[PDB]
Design an enzyme around this catalytic site. Structure first.
Site, mmCIF file in Angstrom:
data_model
loop_
_atom_site.group_PDB
_atom_site.id
_atom_site.type_symbol
_atom_site.label_atom_id
_atom_site.label_comp_id
_atom_site.label_asym_id
_atom_site.label_seq_id
_atom_site.Cartn_x
_atom_site.Cartn_y
_atom_site.Cartn_z
ATOM 1 C CG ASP A 57 46.412 80.123 80.839
ATOM 2 O OD1 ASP A 57 46.564 78.870 80.992
ATOM 3 O OD2 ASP A 57 45.946 80.806 81.663
ATOM 4 C CB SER A 114 49.611 60.612 81.228
ATOM 5 O OG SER A 114 50.759 60.029 80.989
HETATM 6 N N1 LIG Z 1 48.245 80.211 85.175
HETATM 7 C C1 LIG Z 1 48.198 81.587 84.398
HETATM 8 C C2 LIG Z 1 48.958 82.524 84.679
HETATM 9 C C3 LIG Z 1 49.668 83.072 83.944
HETATM 10 C C4 LIG Z 1 50.703 84.213 84.392
HETATM 11 C C5 LIG Z 1 51.000 84.357 85.603
HETATM 12 C C6 LIG Z 1 52.196 85.309 85.870
HETATM 13 F F1 LIG Z 1 53.264 84.778 86.456
HETATM 14 F F2 LIG Z 1 52.575 86.026 84.985
HETATM 15 F F3 LIG Z 1 51.934 86.159 87.096
HETATM 16 C C7 LIG Z 1 50.278 83.822 86.455
HETATM 17 C C8 LIG Z 1 49.296 82.702 86.288
#
Ligand SMILES: NCc1ccc(C(F)(F)F)cc1
Length: 330
Positions: free
Chosen positions: A35, A199
């Site tokens: 992430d 952008s």
């Molecule tokens: N943006 C970070 C994030 C990653 C995964 C998830 C989920 F959908 F797997 F719960 C939520 C938030």
């Protein structure tokens, strides 16, 4: 040194991407969601509340000869979608595609919210935003990238996400065979802890490019592309029957439509997102209303170049002293 690992969509819609990560000795392989919009490496573990684990692979620090409790440290995080997790911290050896960091903070979840429990494919997250966003208290921890940086051949990582197909995360090198043309680099603001850039505009389908500054973040951990309501309305106005539905939570369109492409500017260069990348399928099983991959950032407070945008490009996250973002067509 370098690392190279394959990233795979968790489902038929590319809702998220998972990449295998080795933690501890002997290795425990967990599938983490890399992430670039957060900076905590956290995992489902032997400490996670039993009723909140549903099919995930867990990290068991007691089975690792290199695991050490980071005494007194706790972490607590909430994401943009309302999901959250919290727990305690261990340090352990973590390897991504052959690249090893010793003493990496591995945040062990004691609690996770329902969205995490329901995603059996995601064993945790591996944060790649700036370490200033790390939630470990009282001693803030560095990301896997920050810790590896001084050992890397080049202080970079690249995201090459696939559209309904696997892709690659590389650390420490730029694979010149993975893109076409040249990589256009653009300035990054680290003020909010994100890979935040500007952008230079957009076009809808075969339309004329509109030169306009759109500040936003390159976020691998967000599924969709979230842009200002003006931009998003201009895109959806080209799709017969499309509308914003408050009951669904965004723009929907007839599943019978063929979507136009969406182009975003990176300096004088252009990244074209094919119309098929913007189709997220039926809102519910068997529905003829389909969910749009381009949504308004209005309630968020920040524009998000999520997976919908990033998977149309080869993206360089340059973590040199002056950080920059590179985008190339592929
Ligand atoms: N943006 C970070 C994030 C990653 C995964 C998830 C989920 F959908 F797997 F719960 C939520 C938030």
């Amino acid at each position: 040194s370098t690392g190279s690992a394959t990233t795979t969509p968790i489902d038929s819609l590319d809702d998220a991407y998972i990449t295998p990560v080795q933690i501890g000795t002997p290795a425990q392989t967990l599938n983490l969601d890399f992430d670039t919009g957060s900076s905590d490496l956290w995992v489902f573990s032997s400490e996670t509340t039993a009723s909140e684990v549903d099919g995930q692979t867990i990290y068991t620090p007691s089975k690792s000869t290199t695991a050490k409790l980071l005494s007194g440290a706790t972490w607590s995080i909430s994401y943009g979608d309302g999901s959250s997790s919290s727990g305690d911290v261990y340090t352990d050896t973590v390897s991504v595609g052959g690249l090893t960091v010793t003493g990496q903070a591995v945040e062990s979840a004691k609690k996770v919210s329902s969205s995490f429990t329901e995603d059996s494919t995601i064993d945790g997250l591996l944060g790649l935003a700036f370490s200033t966003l790390n939630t470990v208290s009282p001693t803030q921890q560095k990301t896997f990238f920050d810790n590896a940086k001084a050992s890397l051949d080049s202080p970079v990582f690249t995201a090459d996400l696939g559209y309904h197909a696997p892709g690659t995360y590389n650390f420490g090198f730029i694979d010149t065979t993975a893109y076409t043309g040249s990589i256009t680099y653009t300035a990054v603001s680290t003020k909010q802890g994100f890979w935040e850039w500007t952008s230079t505009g957009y076009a809808v389908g075969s339309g004329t490019f509109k030169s306009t500054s759109i500040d936003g973040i390159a976020d691998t951990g967000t599924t969709l592309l979230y842009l200002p309501a003006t931009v998003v309305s201009a895109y959806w106005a080209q799709v017969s029957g499309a509308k914003s539905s408050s009951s669904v939570g965004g723009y929907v369109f007839p599943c019978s439509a063929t979507l136009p492409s969406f182009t975003f500017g990176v300096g004088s260069a252009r990244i074209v997102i094919p119309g098929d990348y913007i189709d997220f399928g039926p809102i519910s099983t068997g529905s003829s209303s389909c969910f749009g991959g381009i949504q308004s950032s209005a309630g968020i407070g920040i524009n998000i170049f999520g997976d919908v945008a990033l998977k149309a490009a080869f993206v360089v996250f340059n973590g040199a002293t002056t950080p920059t973002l590179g985008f190339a067509s592929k």
